[PDB]
């Protein structure tokens, strides 16, 4: 967000100084676009940015901002092709969290029910289909009202900006 005055000349260690003052744990707009792009085209079918963090945390014990470092190191080492095995994608996340490990300096059944519940969820869907009933219509309408609300709330906010509390009240 904050452009120093000589971006093109002020050296990289000296720019990281200026940027550190104003930023904290923010993965940023441009980096958040780059990590979901790396996850989408390079990760095997089904392997989300969601799944890739639950693996980094389960098998390599990484919290919110520490798995943010492992994703940023994988973004600089992004595969030039999509990984095939989910085990190839797991092995990729492994070596990427150990390149982060020595760049930061730190060393390193309900699932049965999960398979069944999936089944029921589908039995639901197909049934709803037959019934021709829209399960998502609630949230549709809701999201639309939520919009018109910030909209009205907005104009009201403005009128108050112009007239003030005392006058409006």
């Amino acid at each position: 967000g904050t452009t120093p005055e000589k971006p093109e000349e002020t050296p990289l260690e000296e720019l990281a100084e200026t940027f550190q003052d104003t930023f904290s744990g923010a993965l940023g707009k441009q980096s958040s676009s780059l990590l979901s792009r790396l996850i989408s085209s390079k990760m095997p079918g089904g392997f989300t940015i969601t799944v890739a963090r639950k693996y980094l945390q389960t098998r390599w014990g990484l919290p919110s901002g520490r798995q943010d470092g492992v994703l940023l190191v994988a973004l600089s080492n992004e595969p030039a092709a999509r990984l095939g095995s989910e085990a190839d994608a797991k092995a990729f996340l492994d070596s990427m969290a150990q390149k982060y490990a020595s760049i930061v300096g730190v060393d390193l059944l309900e699932e049965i029910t999960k398979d069944h519940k999936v089944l029921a969820r589908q039995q639901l869907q197909v049934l709803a289909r037959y019934l021709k009933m829209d399960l998502d219509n609630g949230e549709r309408k809701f999201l639309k009202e939520k919009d018109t609300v910030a909209e009205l709330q907005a104009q009201l906010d403005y009128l108050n900006a112009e007239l003030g509390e005392f006058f409006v009240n």
């Binding site: 919290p63 520490r66 470092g69």
Partner: peptide
């Protein structure tokens, strides 16, 4: 592990 922000 001790949760660190990104640098």
């Amino acid at each position: 592990i001790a949760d660190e922000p990104v640098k």
